[PDB]
């Protein structure tokens, strides 16, 4: 079981759509890893096509809460909410695969039929969530908040170097590199 | 000299506490023998099983700039904390890592 | 298995819709935790969107009956019955993550085709359920019952700070390094 | 799992609707519990919304036959047959949670397409089941049978204290001091 | 699991729709029970609402085949195909619960679209099935075959005491004193 | 697991409608039992209706191929290919329960839409399967071949004693 | 389970449709069986009603690659891909049961809506696949390629004796 | 099972379509194989009918990143994504079975209903995907890039020898040595 071997080496692997069950599993694994060793880093690999917003928020809070540093690796794609998780890693330890993309866009939602007051409340909540997402993206990046607001109006796709220039990631891995080995 | 300390049961060294802190030891006949003029050396190779290791599991950019000495020192410290009680390691004057 | 390790430290996850099976599992876990140690804290983590009222009452009664203190922690969202369960923890031990939302509203229910007398009985029952809901909310909060009734008329959403001022939670925990 | 432990200390949950599978499992656990120890009590916790009448009668007969005393606890709710099992426990050891309810009403059933004679036979069986139901309710309750017959004409929901006054239970739990 | 413990004590528990799979499971369990001990008796519990006819014949034949006396215990209900199996046990060991009910009627079946010769063959086979069923009922009961023929024309329902009077069972359990 | 115990002794069940999956399952079971001991006997129990004819021929070949003797016991029913399987065991040890039934009829076929030539080839092929059917029925029975031809035109259902008189089985088990 | 046992007696079943998953399973089993003992033969049992052509090609190349002899046994039926797989065994090891049917026909394909160029490419590819199938059938049998090409125009069914006369198998086995 | 052994001797099967879960499992196995022995080559067997582009890029990146050499074998077929995965192996170690087909074509995608701006953004994205795919094909082959541009306009199917001459396969294996 390769996943167990990855977990024993303190790697949390996220390759499914972000929902309540996945968020609960990720938070439980993060808490267990922090309990095992509050000093060694924890690695998170991201291959998710976005997901819900509440699960994103819970995962982000758990990542920011734990003592050890979090090392995020973009792996494939990070479509809607996975991009925030990639940008939420410990600064300087957020890397990505070469032929990977990072997508960013404003949240999309829909509500069932109801009276006008309920729709107004739902719209207020959705605007609050959008503002929160813009704040989280501005805090963990380099570009100003106005640029984020202008960019997330429509789907924006960034390559590895485009993300590095944007500030979401810090390094782009190319090939396995041996250690110095200088005694 | 205690040679290959890690290959003994992790309870014999419980008897070294009073040696390393009070400089004394009592035999079964009740006589006290002092250790205040001796030099205690304990040799071990704990945390040296990964000297011939190139990299760790998982993706990583660039590489570890620390030489083998620093990584092996950290590994030795971790293994020493794992193997011995804190009160035993709190009495040792010096821990020296051999490159 | 992270969940087994969490249960070994007296931690219970509630991240699924509140129904009969989940309520039974939660109550069984609470009884086991009380039996193994009757005078040590039990932590309940809430990440559920709500559920049926009967299961909510069952879980609330089980939490109240079990004597060790219960610490309720909100991680994602706590809506409807989840808000009541979050507010039902031991005072001074109710916590929420910095970015969380608590949603409260009056109960919603459906009934089948039937005669007028059955509909009247069902209406009386649902009004009783709603009244029990305001009673439960007012008991564990620092807000007058009339304000509770006015607030839960429609969907009311509170952030961590809004919930803390509203009395549902007691602390907003930011990080671990900053105690 | 908690269920295995609670079974080790003689606990049976009833959290699903009453049907052949649940009744059969109840039979198996009750018989095994009696065989392992016929001296200690057996606890049955009900959170059922109702079910079929045949499983009702079978489970009632099994509980009556099993000579160790059986405690019954209503945790979340007890509707129709679940109320009957709640009242079918050992007298003096029937309990309900504070914020619980008990629902009682006459049985509901349907019949398929058929000739008049078959419908008459089915209706006679339905009336016999109903009569057995109010007889079994009056057996384990302190209320007159006429009052039960008039009350179960339509649905009836009672709180824990109302059930205690009606005779369904004996004690209403408050807390563990 | 309680079912394994019941099986260890030589009990076969049957509360499911009789079909081919249930028949084969009963075959395997009965053969294994006979192999492990061909002397000690076997108890079979019936809680089924009916079943097919070929499986009924197979299970009846294999249960009459075994050396050990086959006790039959009925809980809740035993209708149509279940009544024959309940009454086919070893004499003196056919047992029913106080509120158990037994339903008896002629076999009910359908046939597909086909030519008149095929429907005639099927109708003759169905008449033969009904004759075999009434012969089985007469063989294992104390009721004349003419009464069985005039009774199984339509649905008929018997309680525990009525089942005892009809000879299908031997005694009615009340409780373990 | 009673199935495991019965397979351990010598027993194999055929109580499911005959198809490719069940055919291969019985193939593996028979080959395994032959490999474990090539000198004992194998008991096969039939409580299933008919099925695909190709699987019938394959399992007939499998029984006629292995050196251990094959015993057939019929409980409940044995229709179409099941009757041929019951009659295909080694002579002298084909038996059925008193209330068991044996059903035999000509093969039923259903092909998809196609050109004339494809349908003609299919018709010749199904005639070949029919001919194999009466050949198998006759070579394992004491009934004249033309009698089998005229009998399998429509549905033919026989009891245990009727099957014994027909020659498909050898003994009728009442009690040990 | 008897399947694993017959695996250590080095017998591999092919009783399901020949698709990608079954092909990969068979290929892995063949590789492992060659690894365990590179000198003893490997038995392949065929009871499959054909399958995809890519799986045919992969299994054919895998059988042709290894040293250990591929001893192919056919029960019940071997149609389309199964016929080629049976005929692809080592010479002298291709044997089949007496009343077993082998069906051979040209490949059948279906494509979705597309432009003319895509349909032309698909037609060229299916013609190439048919040509390759004829090539393997010719190189693994005794019948000349012209008669094989003429025979696969319409579906052709052969018995064990007919297959032996055709040249696909070596000898017919009835009873050990 | 043979799968575990094939993993033990450092061989990974890719027999299903290229999706998120399959790519994740493949790259996890690649990381574990690199960790256990960073010098022995890793063998990858290609039997997939293509898949998604993101999984393609993920597998390609994790295969180029690992220190040990990658030994790719085309087995059965390798279409679209599988063709790139086969051709991305270590030079001199990319081989195919004798009879096999390698299919290459430009990417095909579907876009949901939306405004014109979203559609043109998606068009730019798919054009970028096609450009990246053709550049990756050109990098790991001797064929000129413009030849690949004109070739991948429609479906292009190559045999083992055609792939060998094209620049995607280094040599063809026939029999074990």
GROMACS .gro file of N, CA and C in nm, chain E residues 36-112:
model
  231
  674UNK      N    1  -2.183  -3.375   1.117
  674UNK     CA    2  -2.112  -3.352   1.243
  674UNK      C    3  -2.171  -3.433   1.357
  675UNK      N    4  -2.303  -3.454   1.358
  675UNK     CA    5  -2.365  -3.543   1.456
  675UNK      C    6  -2.496  -3.597   1.399
  676UNK      N    7  -2.499  -3.724   1.358
  676UNK     CA    8  -2.622  -3.783   1.305
  676UNK      C    9  -2.720  -3.833   1.410
  677UNK      N   10  -2.702  -3.797   1.537
  677UNK     CA   11  -2.789  -3.842   1.644
  677UNK      C   12  -2.865  -3.728   1.710
  678UNK      N   13  -2.796  -3.623   1.751
  678UNK     CA   14  -2.861  -3.513   1.821
  678UNK      C   15  -2.955  -3.438   1.727
  679UNK      N   16  -3.067  -3.391   1.782
  679UNK     CA   17  -3.174  -3.335   1.701
  679UNK      C   18  -3.134  -3.199   1.644
  680UNK      N   19  -3.213  -3.154   1.546
  680UNK     CA   20  -3.191  -3.027   1.478
  680UNK      C   21  -3.319  -2.945   1.490
  681UNK      N   22  -3.303  -2.818   1.528
  681UNK     CA   23  -3.414  -2.725   1.543
  681UNK      C   24  -3.413  -2.626   1.428
  682UNK      N   25  -3.529  -2.607   1.365
  682UNK     CA   26  -3.545  -2.516   1.252
  682UNK      C   27  -3.650  -2.412   1.289
  683UNK      N   28  -3.615  -2.285   1.274
  683UNK     CA   29  -3.702  -2.174   1.309
  683UNK      C   30  -3.758  -2.113   1.182
  684UNK      N   31  -3.890  -2.097   1.177
  684UNK     CA   32  -3.961  -2.052   1.058
  684UNK      C   33  -4.023  -1.916   1.085
  685UNK      N   34  -3.984  -1.816   1.006
  685UNK     CA   35  -4.044  -1.683   1.011
  685UNK      C   36  -4.063  -1.628   0.870
  686UNK      N   37  -4.112  -1.712   0.779
  686UNK     CA   38  -4.123  -1.674   0.639
  686UNK      C   39  -4.268  -1.645   0.600
  687UNK      N   40  -4.290  -1.556   0.503
  687UNK     CA   41  -4.426  -1.528   0.456
  687UNK      C   42  -4.474  -1.613   0.339
  688UNK      N   43  -4.393  -1.705   0.289
  688UNK     CA   44  -4.430  -1.790   0.178
  688UNK      C   45  -4.307  -1.830   0.099
  689UNK      N   46  -4.330  -1.898  -0.012
  689UNK     CA   47  -4.220  -1.943  -0.094
  689UNK      C   48  -4.269  -2.018  -0.217
  690UNK      N   49  -4.173  -2.066  -0.295
  690UNK     CA   50  -4.202  -2.141  -0.416
  690UNK      C   51  -4.236  -2.286  -0.382
  691UNK      N   52  -4.267  -2.363  -0.486
  691UNK     CA   53  -4.312  -2.501  -0.466
  691UNK      C   54  -4.200  -2.603  -0.484
  692UNK      N   55  -4.117  -2.588  -0.587
  692UNK     CA   56  -4.008  -2.682  -0.608
  692UNK      C   57  -3.908  -2.678  -0.493
  693UNK      N   58  -3.875  -2.558  -0.446
  693UNK     CA   59  -3.789  -2.546  -0.329
  693UNK      C   60  -3.854  -2.608  -0.206
  694UNK      N   61  -3.986  -2.591  -0.192
  694UNK     CA   62  -4.057  -2.654  -0.082
  694UNK      C   63  -4.043  -2.806  -0.086
  695UNK      N   64  -4.064  -2.865  -0.204
  695UNK     CA   65  -4.050  -3.010  -0.216
  695UNK      C   66  -3.908  -3.054  -0.185
  696UNK      N   67  -3.809  -2.981  -0.235
  696UNK     CA   68  -3.670  -3.018  -0.211
  696UNK      C   69  -3.636  -3.014  -0.062
  697UNK      N   70  -3.675  -2.905   0.006
  697UNK     CA   71  -3.641  -2.892   0.148
  697UNK      C   72  -3.719  -2.993   0.231
  698UNK      N   73  -3.845  -3.020   0.195
  698UNK     CA   74  -3.922  -3.122   0.266
  698UNK      C   75  -3.857  -3.259   0.252
  699UNK      N   76  -3.815  -3.294   0.131
  699UNK     CA   77  -3.752  -3.424   0.109
  699UNK      C   78  -3.621  -3.435   0.187
  700UNK      N   79  -3.538  -3.330   0.183
  700UNK     CA   80  -3.409  -3.340   0.251
  700UNK      C   81  -3.425  -3.337   0.402
  701UNK      N   82  -3.531  -3.272   0.453
  701UNK     CA   83  -3.554  -3.270   0.597
  701UNK      C   84  -3.614  -3.401   0.646
  702UNK      N   85  -3.695  -3.467   0.564
  702UNK     CA   86  -3.737  -3.603   0.597
  702UNK      C   87  -3.625  -3.704   0.577
  703UNK      N   88  -3.522  -3.668   0.501
  703UNK     CA   89  -3.413  -3.761   0.473
  703UNK      C   90  -3.323  -3.782   0.595
  704UNK      N   91  -3.301  -3.677   0.674
  704UNK     CA   92  -3.200  -3.681   0.780
  704UNK      C   93  -3.248  -3.770   0.895
  705UNK      N   94  -3.151  -3.834   0.960
  705UNK     CA   95  -3.181  -3.914   1.079
  705UNK      C   96  -3.234  -3.832   1.196
  706UNK      N   97  -3.171  -3.721   1.237
  706UNK     CA   98  -3.216  -3.653   1.360
  706UNK      C   99  -3.359  -3.602   1.348
  707UNK      N  100  -3.430  -3.605   1.460
  707UNK     CA  101  -3.563  -3.547   1.465
  707UNK      C  102  -3.555  -3.398   1.439
  708UNK      N  103  -3.641  -3.349   1.350
  708UNK     CA  104  -3.637  -3.210   1.306
  708UNK      C  105  -3.747  -3.135   1.380
  709UNK      N  106  -3.709  -3.067   1.488
  709UNK     CA  107  -3.802  -2.979   1.557
  709UNK      C  108  -3.826  -2.854   1.474
  710UNK      N  109  -3.951  -2.810   1.469
  710UNK     CA  110  -3.989  -2.688   1.398
  710UNK      C  111  -4.048  -2.590   1.499
  711UNK      N  112  -4.000  -2.466   1.497
  711UNK     CA  113  -4.048  -2.361   1.586
  711UNK      C  114  -4.091  -2.243   1.501
  712UNK      N  115  -4.215  -2.199   1.517
  712UNK     CA  116  -4.271  -2.091   1.437
  712UNK      C  117  -4.282  -1.963   1.520
  713UNK      N  118  -4.230  -1.853   1.466
  713UNK     CA  119  -4.241  -1.721   1.527
  713UNK      C  120  -4.310  -1.627   1.430
  714UNK      N  121  -4.402  -1.546   1.482
  714UNK     CA  122  -4.463  -1.440   1.404
  714UNK      C  123  -4.565  -1.486   1.302
  715UNK      N  124  -4.519  -1.555   1.198
  715UNK     CA  125  -4.608  -1.597   1.091
  715UNK      C  126  -4.545  -1.712   1.015
  716UNK      N  127  -4.631  -1.791   0.950
  716UNK     CA  128  -4.588  -1.899   0.862
  716UNK      C  129  -4.701  -1.921   0.762
  717UNK      N  130  -4.684  -1.867   0.642
  717UNK     CA  131  -4.791  -1.860   0.543
  717UNK      C  132  -4.760  -1.947   0.422
  718UNK      N  133  -4.864  -2.012   0.369
  718UNK     CA  134  -4.855  -2.090   0.247
  718UNK      C  135  -4.744  -2.195   0.253
  719UNK      N  136  -4.633  -2.168   0.184
  719UNK     CA  137  -4.524  -2.265   0.178
  719UNK      C  138  -4.459  -2.287   0.314
  720UNK      N  139  -4.471  -2.192   0.406
  720UNK     CA  140  -4.412  -2.209   0.538
  720UNK      C  141  -4.493  -2.304   0.625
  721UNK      N  142  -4.625  -2.308   0.606
  721UNK     CA  143  -4.710  -2.395   0.686
  721UNK      C  144  -4.676  -2.542   0.664
  722UNK      N  145  -4.651  -2.580   0.538
  722UNK     CA  146  -4.617  -2.718   0.507
  722UNK      C  147  -4.489  -2.759   0.579
  723UNK      N  148  -4.387  -2.672   0.575
  723UNK     CA  149  -4.262  -2.703   0.643
  723UNK      C  150  -4.280  -2.705   0.795
  724UNK      N  151  -4.367  -2.619   0.848
  724UNK     CA  152  -4.392  -2.619   0.991
  724UNK      C  153  -4.458  -2.749   1.035
  725UNK      N  154  -4.554  -2.799   0.957
  725UNK     CA  155  -4.626  -2.920   0.992
  725UNK      C  156  -4.554  -3.048   0.949
  726UNK      N  157  -4.444  -3.037   0.875
  726UNK     CA  158  -4.374  -3.155   0.825
  726UNK      C  159  -4.262  -3.201   0.918
  727UNK      N  160  -4.243  -3.136   1.032
  727UNK     CA  161  -4.138  -3.174   1.124
  727UNK      C  162  -4.167  -3.308   1.190
  728UNK      N  163  -4.075  -3.349   1.275
  728UNK     CA  164  -4.091  -3.475   1.346
  728UNK      C  165  -4.213  -3.467   1.439
  729UNK      N  166  -4.290  -3.575   1.451
  729UNK     CA  167  -4.409  -3.570   1.537
  729UNK      C  168  -4.372  -3.541   1.682
  730UNK      N  169  -4.457  -3.463   1.748
  730UNK     CA  170  -4.435  -3.428   1.887
  730UNK      C  171  -4.338  -3.314   1.911
  731UNK      N  172  -4.282  -3.255   1.806
  731UNK     CA  173  -4.185  -3.147   1.820
  731UNK      C  174  -4.214  -3.036   1.720
  732UNK      N  175  -4.342  -3.000   1.708
  732UNK     CA  176  -4.386  -2.888   1.625
  732UNK      C  177  -4.444  -2.782   1.717
  733UNK      N  178  -4.381  -2.665   1.720
  733UNK     CA  179  -4.397  -2.569   1.828
  733UNK      C  180  -4.428  -2.431   1.771
  734UNK      N  181  -4.515  -2.358   1.841
  734UNK     CA  182  -4.556  -2.226   1.797
  734UNK      C  183  -4.560  -2.130   1.915
  735UNK      N  184  -4.538  -2.003   1.886
  735UNK     CA  185  -4.545  -1.896   1.984
  735UNK      C  186  -4.690  -1.857   2.009
  736UNK      N  187  -4.720  -1.790   2.121
  736UNK     CA  188  -4.861  -1.760   2.153
  736UNK      C  189  -4.933  -1.680   2.045
  737UNK      N  190  -4.867  -1.582   1.985
  737UNK     CA  191  -4.932  -1.492   1.891
  737UNK      C  192  -4.898  -1.524   1.745
  738UNK      N  193  -4.827  -1.633   1.720
  738UNK     CA  194  -4.795  -1.671   1.583
  738UNK      C  195  -4.921  -1.708   1.506
  739UNK      N  196  -4.918  -1.684   1.375
  739UNK     CA  197  -5.031  -1.713   1.288
  739UNK      C  198  -4.985  -1.796   1.170
  740UNK      N  199  -5.075  -1.881   1.120
  740UNK     CA  200  -5.048  -1.969   1.007
  740UNK      C  201  -5.152  -1.942   0.899
  741UNK      N  202  -5.105  -1.917   0.777
  741UNK     CA  203  -5.192  -1.889   0.664
  741UNK      C  204  -5.179  -2.001   0.562
  742UNK      N  205  -5.293  -2.052   0.514
  742UNK     CA  206  -5.296  -2.162   0.419
  742UNK      C  207  -5.389  -2.127   0.304
  743UNK      N  208  -5.347  -2.163   0.182
  743UNK     CA  209  -5.425  -2.143   0.061
  743UNK      C  210  -5.360  -2.224  -0.050
  744UNK      N  211  -5.433  -2.239  -0.161
  744UNK     CA  212  -5.383  -2.315  -0.274
  744UNK      C  213  -5.269  -2.239  -0.342
  745UNK      N  214  -5.182  -2.310  -0.414
  745UNK     CA  215  -5.070  -2.243  -0.482
  745UNK      C  216  -5.119  -2.141  -0.585
  746UNK      N  217  -5.044  -2.032  -0.596
  746UNK     CA  218  -5.073  -1.923  -0.688
  746UNK      C  219  -4.957  -1.910  -0.785
  747UNK      N  220  -4.987  -1.903  -0.914
  747UNK     CA  221  -4.883  -1.905  -1.016
  747UNK      C  222  -4.930  -1.835  -1.143
  748UNK      N  223  -4.833  -1.806  -1.230
  748UNK     CA  224  -4.857  -1.746  -1.360
  748UNK      C  225  -4.775  -1.819  -1.465
  749UNK      N  226  -4.818  -1.810  -1.590
  749UNK     CA  227  -4.744  -1.866  -1.702
  749UNK      C  228  -4.730  -1.761  -1.812
  750UNK      N  229  -4.627  -1.778  -1.895
  750UNK     CA  230  -4.599  -1.683  -2.000
  750UNK      C  231  -4.686  -1.703  -2.123
   0.00000   0.00000   0.00000
